[PDB]
């Protein structure tokens, strides 16, 4: 048998159609991720990605941060998450400015308006996710 | 503005007209429904409708939040937050852009009651009762 | 203005949008001075001029340096940092059918001079803030005592 | 027909003829259920075998009894296991919904040039799945009867 | 005063140079 | 017949929606009547001290004898927590399959309200209704509706008897109906 064939029946493209690259599991999961999901607007793509990253970003600061052994450990973790998210959304905005200089199409991540909607979604979502993880970690004794 | 349910045109102060209305009518529906459930729970709890349990026996609405904040109200927070998250996914995808949706129609008509001939009756009763329950709950909370 | 096309594009600079936003912030700031003044008159903030410690606020405490960072200072710091967090959320996040901090590509800055009422009140509030800060500086008195 | 479940000791084993006069949809459902049971039972049998004598997690002193251990596990761990399995199952459902869909192939084997070697190894998977299906039920039954794990029961 | 190190050192050595790096990157990626 | 061969609805609850809503209401009526009939038979089996022999839970040491002894509704609370989980889970799967596996579609949107036979041998497992025909079966379904409504009234009667003083005649004294009036799922919660 042969589970490694040319990518899209093109032997001269620099890729291989391995199980990892071209399996139905990989295709399903990637195509269903928000950045690839069909029908999602750029705002919702950014929103889902933002909440996703903001929920987990608080944790390293909370437990491994300098004030882990302090009564305000989770507060400092949330503030650190907000700062890191501010840096990340600044990076997103400058990336959009540098890449999609001249664009008018919109409704597309590869355009200025679409990337701006995506960045707004990411920023709000990540702030909300950091706050939500703060709220859950305050009341973790519930579970 | 005009062309919506309960349009008395009661708008002396300026809030929305060529804009915002997609959000404003839907927020009025959400606030109204919240008010109906809030006032109904307040009256039921004050009347005597209670969960079966030792902790719930003594609590009476106003004195109940602080004790029921951490365990059961947190589960309520989780459920409400999930439903509001899918609601936000539907909502932000409408108002910021111009995709087609109606204000407050989350598609929650599982019994197909809007197929009744008197569907404008519901699209009127909902808003009126939300407003009335809002004015009611403002009173019941500001008495105490 | 013209020499700074980049900042002029998004309203950053001597622009009507910037004046509007700064007037709104000056309004909220005068409110904040009045609110924290009545808060100090009442008992909300911790008293005693208790300095922060490394065991609670770490190197941001500056326990042994100098500069007497207090628990009331830490709490108001948390409040204003939360304001700054909501700020980044509102500015960068989706404009909830309100005002964009940035001009945006399509919009052009409103014509320079209820919205006009906001701008008049904002100019008044900025003038009040500057006058209070000056009066404190010349007199040597505290800002809260000056407004009191 | 068209599947690879047949083997030597029993041939094409269908005494009650469920597949007889049945649709390809029902046949695919049967094979998906078969492979899912086999795989879950492999995981179960391996878990009991290893955790009976080597269970470092959770303080290193959780009960070696399979039935007692899951009750001893915290609620959050069970919730996380359920979430993980559900997240695999939504992709199972989507693979079922796909236009090209063999029953248990998350790998998408149809796009590659497969051979009797691939067929034989699919048969290996299926046979091991059948054996593990019997094994897991046996292990759980012995755990309920005697209260010992698999290897302690053998001890 | 002893206020000013706290006010100025982070403003001048986190915010300003980050903004300068952003501005330089955006400028060099023009046209 | 007993109601006078008419719509029976004096308040207007029938046409709050449409045909889909009426189908949902009829299916809900059928399900309620079926559970009420089963509950009535279970109540009689309990209060007559009919139960299976053995230990319900040999590990926690709770028995069918204890369940029968204490009272009808209390017995549910004395079932072990995991046993109640199992009962409600097995009902959960049946309800979900009832919602889904109808080939025609939903009872509101193509299926017959109350029809559950698409789950094979769920009904008439020994096959009493196999001999019957459609004309007899419509008559029998009318009988099912009548008995379901009547058992509904009965279970509502006995619940009020066991919760609030002597509401119902002929049970307004029976010490048979004691214990709590309304069990909760999983006991306390
Ligand atoms: C090149 C000279 C120089 C150097 C190396 C430093 C170094 C320092 N100053 Mg600064 N400072 C300077 C001149 C200088 N200062 C001058 C002339 C003044 C006005 C009188 C100040 C007033 C001042 C205050 C009030 C404070 C500091 C502080 C500090 C420390 C933190 C950095 C900071 O934010 O300061 C910069 C702060 C400013 C307000 C900007 C000053 C602008 C200078 C004059 C720019 C000179 C540029 C240089 C010649 C070439 C370009 C550099 C770069 C672009 C490549 C640091 C040790 C803080 C401290 O004490 O921390 C412990 C602090 O609170 N400085
Ligand atoms: C070294 C860095 C680091 C550190 C120190 C932490 C610290 C923390 N993380 Mg973690 N986290 C990290 C990296 C890190 N994380 C990374 C890289 C990711 C992405 C892979 C995550 C993803 C993540 C999630 C999703 C969650 C945490 C949570 C936590 C908390 C665990 C302690 C607790 O409250 O237990 C309590 C433990 C739990 C409630 C169980 C959480 C388990 C999650 C849900 C795992 C996924 C389950 C399952 C496989 C999902 C299938 C898919 C579905 C769609 C804590 C603040 C949890 C939290 O916020 O607690 C309130 C939490 O839910 N983290
Ligand atoms: C200390 C209080 C204070 C606060 C909270 C703000 C806040 C703001 N100013 Mg600033 N500003 C201040 C004092 C303050 N200002 C003073 C004292 C002046 C007079 C010199 C200005 C002059 C000024 C201008 C000329 C502009 C701003 C702008 C802004 C906005 C963006 C600034 C930014 O990105 O910063 C960096 C991080 C923001 C709402 C900009 C704006 O509104 O852009 C649309 C803008 O153009 N401000
Ligand atoms: C429940 C799991 C399960 C399922 C869904 C299937 C499904 C299938 N098997 Mg079977 N199979 C299983 C377990 C299962 N198998 C086990 C454990 C063995 C080992 C004895 C086999 C051995 C086997 C062989 C050798 C072959 C098949 C084949 C097939 C396929 C065609 C026959 C058919 O229609 O079966 C339909 C099966 C069902 C509808 C499942 C009915 C299960 C009943 C209700 C339970 C009976 C067991 C009893 C209650 C308890 C046993 C003792 C103990 C565990 C308590 C089909 C995909 C044939 C094939 O693939 O040909 C190409 C084939 O050749 N199977
Ligand atoms: C049917 C599947 C199944 C189920 C329901 C359980 C259930 C349990 N296992 Mg696990 N376990 C499984 C498969 C399973 N196991 C497999 C395949 C292995 C071999 C790698 C193990 C190895 C194992 C050990 C060594 C231990 C447990 C333990 C546990 C407890 C929770 C922690 C855990 O799951 O870590 C599972 C950890 C893994 C690395 C398994 C990965 C599973 C892949 C990704 C699928 C619980 C009783 C602990 C316990 O209570 O022991 C007494 C414990 O110490 N399990
Ligand atoms: C619920 C779990 C199983 C789910 C899997 C499953 O699918 O189940 C199917 C199912 C029924 C079902 C259906 C649905 C699936 C609902 C829907 C389907 O319809 C459709 C799809 O259309 C058909 C239908 C109606 O049939 C039900 C299965 C139920 C099952 C299998 C229930 C096991 C209990 C064991 C107990 C309580 C053990 C106690 C053990 C205890 C308390 C011990 O002490 C053990 C012990 O070791 C301890 C701890 C310590 C040691 O000293 C030794 C001892 C010995 C003392
Ligand atoms: C199905 C497989 C599986 C996967 C793929 C998976 C993935 C991740 C990831 C992402 C990659 C993270 C970030 C994460 C984090 C944590 N997992 Mg987890 N996990 C799985 C299974 C279990 C089980 C069975 C348990 C468990 C636990 C914990 C705890 C400890 C909390 C604590 O200290 O109390 C934390 C923080 C234990 C627990 O919740 O204990 C109460 C527990 O029993 N996990 N887990
Ligand atoms: C001389 C001259 C000119 C001129 C002129 C004139 C008349 C210029 C006048 C300028 C003037 C008078 C400019 C004041 C600005 C004040 C601001 C922005 C303050 C905001 C302050 C804010 C937003 C503070 C807010 C808060 O802190 C508060 C208060 C409370 C705290 O809890 C925290 C917060 C953040 C909430 C030209 C036109 C320039 C050129 C020409 O050739 C000649
Ligand atoms: C049904 C189905 C499938 C399935 C499945 C099944 C059955 C999957 C099962 C998966 C399973 C069972 C996965 C467990 C993981 C456990 C982990 C990672 C434990 C972490 C443990 C951690 C992080 C910590 C443990 C601690 O104890 C430590 C060490 C110290 C103590 O102080 C306390 C704590 C808590 C901190 C297929 C086959 C996949 C596909 C098919 O199509 C459909
Ligand atoms: C048709 C119509 C109308 C109507 C109507 C009316 C009056 C409707 C009434 C409906 C009513 C009254 C519905 C009751 C359901 C009761 C249930 C499901 C009880 C379950 C009870 C159970 C499952 C009990 C179980 C157990 O006890 C058992 C069996 C033995 C114990 O060991 C264990 C426990 C305790 C668990 C109007 C108003 C006239 C006009 C309108 O327009 C349309
Ligand atoms: C409120 C009140 C009271 C009351 C009450 C009331 C009204 C109680 C009512 C209880 C009620 C009405 C209980 C029905 C059970 C019906 C069952 C189990 C039927 C099963 C029927 C079956 C299983 C039929 C099967 C088949 O026929 C099928 C379908 C077709 C054939 O092919 C095959 C066969 C033959 C097998 C008190 C307390 C008494 C007095 C007080 O004063 C007032
Ligand atoms: C695949 C896989 C994996 C991985 C996994 C992962 C990676 C996971 C993750 C997970 C996670 C990571 C999760 C998450 C969650 C989340 C959450 C829970 C969130 C929430 C949020 C919210 C709630 C928000 C809200 C808000 C606010 C607050 C404000 C406003 C806005 C908004 C609305 C947004 C593993 C390897 C393991 C295994 C195999 C498979």
Curated annotation (Swiss-Prot), chain A:
GO terms for cellular component: chloroplast thylakoid membrane; photosystem I reaction center. InterPro entries: PSI_PsaL (IPR003757), PSI_PsaL_sf (IPR036592), PSI_suXI (IPR022980). It comes from the Eukaryota. One of its GO terms (biological process) is photosynthesis. The keyword Chloroplast applies. It is a multi-pass membrane protein. It is found in: Plastid, Chloroplast thylakoid membrane. The keyword Thylakoid applies. Keywords: Chloroplast, Membrane, Photosynthesis, Photosystem I, Plastid, Thylakoid, Transmembrane, Transmembrane helix. The chain crosses the membrane at residues 47-67, 74-94, 124-143. Its main location: plastid. Belongs to the PsaL family. PANTHER family: PHOTOSYSTEM I REACTION CENTER SUBUNIT XI, CHLOROPLASTIC (PTHR34803:SF2). This is Photosystem I reaction center subunit XI. The gene is psaL.
Swiss-Prot record, chain E:
Its main location: plastid. Keywords: Chloroplast, Membrane, Photosynthesis, Photosystem I, Plastid, Thylakoid, Transmembrane, Transmembrane helix. GO terms for cellular component: chloroplast thylakoid membrane; photosystem I. One of its GO terms (biological process) is photosynthesis. The chain crosses the membrane at residues 7-27. The keyword Transmembrane applies. It is found in: Plastid, Chloroplast thylakoid membrane. InterPro entries: PSI_PsaI, PSI_PsaI_sf. It comes from the Eukaryota. It is a single-pass membrane protein. Belongs to the PsaI family. NCBIfam families: PS_I_psaI (TIGR03052). May help in the organization of the PsaL subunit. This is Photosystem I reaction center subunit VIII. It comes from Emiliania huxleyi.
């Amino acid at each position: 048998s042969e589970f490694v064939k040319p990518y899209n029946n093109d032997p001269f493209v620099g890729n291989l159609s391995t199980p990892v690259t071209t399996s139905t599991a990989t295709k399903l999961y990637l195509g269903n991720l928000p950045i690839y999901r069909k029908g999602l607007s750029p705002l919702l793509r950014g929103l889902e990605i933002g909440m996703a990253h903001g929920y987990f970003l608080i944790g390293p600061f909370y437990i491994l941060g300098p004030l882990r052994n302090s009564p305000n450990a989770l507060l400092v973790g949330l503030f650190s998450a907000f700062g890191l998210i501010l840096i990340l959304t600044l990076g997103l905005t400058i990336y959009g400015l540098a890449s999609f200089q001249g664009t008018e199409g919109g409704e597309n991540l590869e355009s200025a308006k679409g990337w701006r909607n995506f960045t707004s979604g990411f920023s709000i979502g990540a702030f909300g996710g950091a706050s939500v993880a703060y709220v859950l970690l305050d009341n973790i004794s519930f579970f | 503005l005009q062309g919506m349910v309960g349009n008395v045109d009661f708008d002396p102060l300026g809030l929305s007209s060529p804009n915002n209305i997609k959000w404003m009518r839907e927020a009025e529906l959400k606030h109204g429904r919240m008010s109906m459930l809030a006032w109904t729970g307040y009256v039921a709890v004050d009347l005597g409708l209670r969960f079966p349990g030792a902790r719930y026996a003594e609590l009476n609405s106003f004195n109940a939040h602080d004790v029921v904040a951490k365990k059961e109200l947190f589960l309520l927070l989780l459920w409400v937050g999930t439903f509001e998250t899918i609601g936000a996914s539907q909502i932000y995808d409408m108002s910021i852009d111009q995709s087609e949706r109606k204000p407050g129609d989350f598609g929650f008509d599982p019994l197909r009651l809007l197929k009744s001939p008197e569907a404008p009756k519901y699209y009127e009763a909902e808003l009126v009762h939300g407003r009335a329950a809002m004015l009611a709950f403002s009173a019941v909370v500001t008495q105490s | 203005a013209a020499d700074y096309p980049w900042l002029a594009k998004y309203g950053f600079g001597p622009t009507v949008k910037a004046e509007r936003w700064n007037g709104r912030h000056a309004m909220f700031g005068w409110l904040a001075i009045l609110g924290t003044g009545v808060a100090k008159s009442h008992g909300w903030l911790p008293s005693g001029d208790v300095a922060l410690t490394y065991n609670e606020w770490g190197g941001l405490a500056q326990q042994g340096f100098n500069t007497y960072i207090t628990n009331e200072r830490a709490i108001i710091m948390i409040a204003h940092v939360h304001a700054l967090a909501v700020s980044a959320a509102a500015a960068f996040g989706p404009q909830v059918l309100g005002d964009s901090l940035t001009l945006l590509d399509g919009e052009k800055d409103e014509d320079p001079y209820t919205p006009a009422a906001e701008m008049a009140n904002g100019r008044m509030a900025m003038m009040g803030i500057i006058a209070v800060v000056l009066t404190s500086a010349i007199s040597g008195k505290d800002i809260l005592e000056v407004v009191d | 027909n068209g599947m690879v479940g047949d083997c030597k000791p029993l041939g094409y084993f269908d005494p009650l003829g469920f597949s007889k006069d049945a649709s390809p949809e029902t046949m695919a459902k049967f094979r998906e259920a078969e492979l899912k049971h086999g795989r879950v039972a492999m995981l179960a049998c391996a878990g009991m075998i290893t955790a009976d004598k080597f269970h470092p997690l959770f303080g290193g002193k959780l009960s070696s009894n399979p039935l007692l251990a899951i009750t001893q596990v915290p609620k959050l761990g069970l919730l996380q296991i359920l979430l993980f399995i559900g997240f695999m199952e939504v992709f199972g459902i989507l693979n079922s919904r796909r236009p090209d869909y063999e029953p248990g192939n998350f790998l998408g084997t149809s796009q590659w040039e497969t051979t009797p070697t691939w067929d034989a190894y699919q048969l290996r998977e299926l046979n091991n799945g059948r054996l593990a299906m019997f094994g897991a039920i046996g292990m759980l039954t012995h755990a309920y009867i005697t209260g010992k794990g698999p290897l302690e029961l053998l001890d | 005063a002893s206020f000013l190190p706290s006010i100025l050192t982070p403003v001048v050595t986190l915010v300003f140079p980050g903004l300068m790096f952003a501005l330089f990157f955006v400028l060099i990626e023009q046209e | 017949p007993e109601t006078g061969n008419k719509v029976f609805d004096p308040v207007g609850f029938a046409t709050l929606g449409g045909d889909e809503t009426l189908a949902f209401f009829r299916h809900a009526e059928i399900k309620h009547g079926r559970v009420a009939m089963a509950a009535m038979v279970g109540f009689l089996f309990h209060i007559n001290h009919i139960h299976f022999p053995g230990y319900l839970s040999p590990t926690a040491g709770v028995t069918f004898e204890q369940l029968s002894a204490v009272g009808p509704f209390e017995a549910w609370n004395m079932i072990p927590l995991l046993g109640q989980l199992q009962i409600l889970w097995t009902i959960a799967g049946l309800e979900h399959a009832s919602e889904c596996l109808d080939p025609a579609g939903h009872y509101t949107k193509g299926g017959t309200p109350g029809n559950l036979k698409f789950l094979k041998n769920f009904w008439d497992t020994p096959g009493f209704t196999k001999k019957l025909t459609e004309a007899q079966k419509a008559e029998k379904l009318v009988s099912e509706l009548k008995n379901g409504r009547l058992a509904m009234i009965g279970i509502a009667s006995v619940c009020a008897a066991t919760a609030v003083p002597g509401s119902v005649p002929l049970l307004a004294n029976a010490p048979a109906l004691t214990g709590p009036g309304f069990a909760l799922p999983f006991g306390t919660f």
